[PDB]
Amino acid sequence: MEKYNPHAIEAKWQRFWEEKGFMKAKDLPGGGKQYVLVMFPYPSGDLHMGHLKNYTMGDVLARFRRMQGYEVLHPMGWDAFGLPAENAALKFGVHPKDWTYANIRQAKESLRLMGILYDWDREVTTCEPEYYRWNQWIFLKMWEKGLAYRAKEQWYLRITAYAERLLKDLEGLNWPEKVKAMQRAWIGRSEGAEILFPVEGKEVRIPVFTTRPDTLFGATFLVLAPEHPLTLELAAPEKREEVLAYVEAAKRKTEIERQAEGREKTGVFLGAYALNPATGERIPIWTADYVLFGYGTGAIMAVPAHDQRDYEFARKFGLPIKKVIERPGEPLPEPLERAYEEPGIMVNSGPFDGTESEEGKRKVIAWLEEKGLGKGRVTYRLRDWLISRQRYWGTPIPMVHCVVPVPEEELPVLLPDLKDVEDISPLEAHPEFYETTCPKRDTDTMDTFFDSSWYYLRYTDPHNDRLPFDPEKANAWMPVDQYIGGVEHAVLHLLYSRFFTKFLHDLGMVKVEEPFQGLFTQGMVLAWTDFGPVEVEGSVVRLPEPTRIRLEIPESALSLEDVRKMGAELRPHEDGTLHLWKPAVMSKSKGNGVMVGPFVKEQGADIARITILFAAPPENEMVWTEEGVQGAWRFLNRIYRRVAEDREALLETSGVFQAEALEGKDRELYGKLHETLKKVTEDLEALRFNTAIAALMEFLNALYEYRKDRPVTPVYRTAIRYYLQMLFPFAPHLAEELWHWFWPDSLFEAGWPELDEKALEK
Ligand SMILES: [Hg+2]
DSSP states (O other): OOOOOOTTHHHHHHHHHHHHTTTOOOSSOOOOEEEEEEOOOOOOSSOBHHHHHHHHHHHHHHHHHHHHTOEEEOOOOBOOOSHHHHHHHHHHOOOHHHHHHHHHHHHHHHHHHTTOOOOGGGOOBTTSHHHHHHHHHHHHHHHHTTOEEEEOOEEEEOGGGGHHHHHHTTTTOOSOHHHHHHHHHHHOEEEEEEEEEEBTTOSOEEEEEESOGGGGGGOOEEEEOTTOTTTTTSOOGGGHHHHHHHHHHHHTSOHHHHSOTTSOOOEEEEEEEEEOTTTOOEEEEEEETTSOSSSTTSEEEEOGGGOHHHHHHHHHHTOOOOOOEEBTTBOOOSSOSSOOOSOOEEOSSGGGTTOBHHHHHHHHHHHHHHHTSEEEEEEESOOOEEOEEOOSSSEEOOEEOOOEEOOGGGOOOOOOOOSOSTTOOGGGGOHHHHOOOOOOBOOOEEOHHHHHTTHHHHTTSTTOSSSSOOHHHHHHHOSBSEEEEOOTTOHHHHHHHHHHHHHHHHTTSOSOSOSBSOEEEOOOEEEEEEEEEEEEETTEEEOOHHHHHHHTOSOSEEEHHHHHHTTOEEEEOTTSSEEEEEEEEOOTTTTOOOBHHHHHHHSOHHHHHHHHHHHSOTTSOEEEOHHHHHHHHHHHHHHHHHHHHTHHHHHTOOOOOOGGGOOHHHHHHHHHHHHHHHHHHHHHHTTOHHHHHHHHHHHHHHHHHHHHHSOSOHHHHHHHHHHHHHHTTTSHHHHHHHHTTTOSSOHHHHOOOOOOTGGGOO
8 A cells, every 4th residue: 555645745735725716816706805914025035934933824724715705805915015126136136027037936936835725816016117106106195185294304204193993993903912003013103192381471381291190399490402493582781692593503403413412402592481381480591402392392391300311410500409299118318419300209299299199190180271371281102103214225205396296197106227237316317218398306215114005906806907995895805804914013013004904994995994803923944943052060050151142142152041041952962062953933044944935846735734733822922843753753654554445445435324324433433523623623724734634633633543443434434524624724735635535526515514503412
């Protein structure tokens, strides 16, 4: 009897599935659908098992949903723009376009060889004009809606205008809490307050914003930015000269060097005074370079005792320092050597004395609103999105500097046609490019994050040359049911995407306001890596510089316990010394990547898929090991052997039987079959792919145990049929192969087995 052999059968089925177009997505789903999306990769060459873990996950879900009868959209594309292609050009002296298309061909083959099936008709390549013309289109619509502006002097997207919705809409979002929390923390909603300071002898009252209203009684002076309209106006007669000069000198500088840590503290007393609303005390008004006009109201109240910058300023110019916050368990030192910036208890704050700091902010705000001295104001840490880039390989900003927007019908604004590779601001060295008539071209390209903030919508209508996409098509496929990928480092991408969707929704183009209904997070794939020799003495491990550098840690010494805790192990080398080994993120740089092409050629696709899928929960990190590979071989070998051994008998057997009439082991098998179907189905729907495989391994053992006592029976034949259907999503090639031994059509046409509720009883 022969044995399982991945070679030949896999290439056979891969072509079969493609030609049959089983995974082609309909233009408009009708009565349900499933949109399975995996984060598209940067076209940087051949992929390794780390990348394939995500793509395999997507293929499993897609095949499963397809078998259930859903209309499935599982597309692949390329995040082609960016620096990678540019660095390559400067290295190999090749056009970025050529390097990209070559890498695309390789990655595509790697995906195909793993048995991954996409609707390639919906392929997108971001570096193509057919795609980035729509980036420019969207950019104009944002400009037209006041969401895109220029500021000193690059372009920005007013994402902060959606800060509140980006935060609020998270509540109804069914994502992992850890991801939602990272979104919340990045946006950073904070409770603040705008306080009004009356100016002695003047009509004007100076507005000041602060997140520490709890320290109001400690405000000993005000500080206006030099560019503040009140700096010169309030400047006393015998101070206007000095102030005027300072203001001018301030402009000659930049906000970076003004807010630069280390520089000496400079400033000028305006000769004018303000009244502290809380104490009614008279405080001097100053102007200083460290205060910028762009933030808050361009003016701040200074609380030396609780803000280190104000402390240094007060100390340098001899300004009063008043303590109003203390630690709960001890009074502050006297005199004060530095500012105490942490929460505590309010003191020297009139009626607020003894009030806990955080709660005190609310009391003071509420107090200010009642007396009409100030109001609560919400602030966000989230800043606007800087999209301007001085690079060649990117989407050109559709703007002209006569600042006029390029006409919608004149789009796209194509990139210059080089002559040199070193020729790559890059757009500035192209006179025949920026030289145009007013309706000079902008010489900046868009941050590639712009490209990826809506690619999932383009997939719904990839060939539309009139709009980024037809609302009808997009609304039919959206939202994405499961977005697959690592999130640990995708805070921005997720935020930017949600932003784009909400904007496109405001334009009436998208029904939903949240692009990803579900996040299928994937942990990193690791691989045992040799970091170098070490020297051990007692419980201490000395790390030679080369070894320590590869590990990227500050310790030149580790305890045996530290080594264990990090998941490392000291292993004897033939060189006669011990080396420190440890699972490390699989990446080309680390030189620990397991390339798809080579592996599949030497082993197989199903073997790789099972190795990845069974290693651990998808959300957890996993280590690719030869042990896992052999375990995969063993499992596939046993499935093949079981069916091969009973092939002759199975052929002469009918699968028709009466469940109620089953007895003994036959009835026991029927029960186990359906319990397995339930576990596998629910594990798949819950994204617990490793446990689904475990259930299949367990049921395979039950099949072997059954055949010890019973022959090939109708119920057994049905169990084999169901098994192959349940196996298809995980190891599609072997499943399809064995299926054709007894059945005519493809597993894609067999559907998903129907669960028998009653069989689960008792
Ligand atoms: Hg391109």
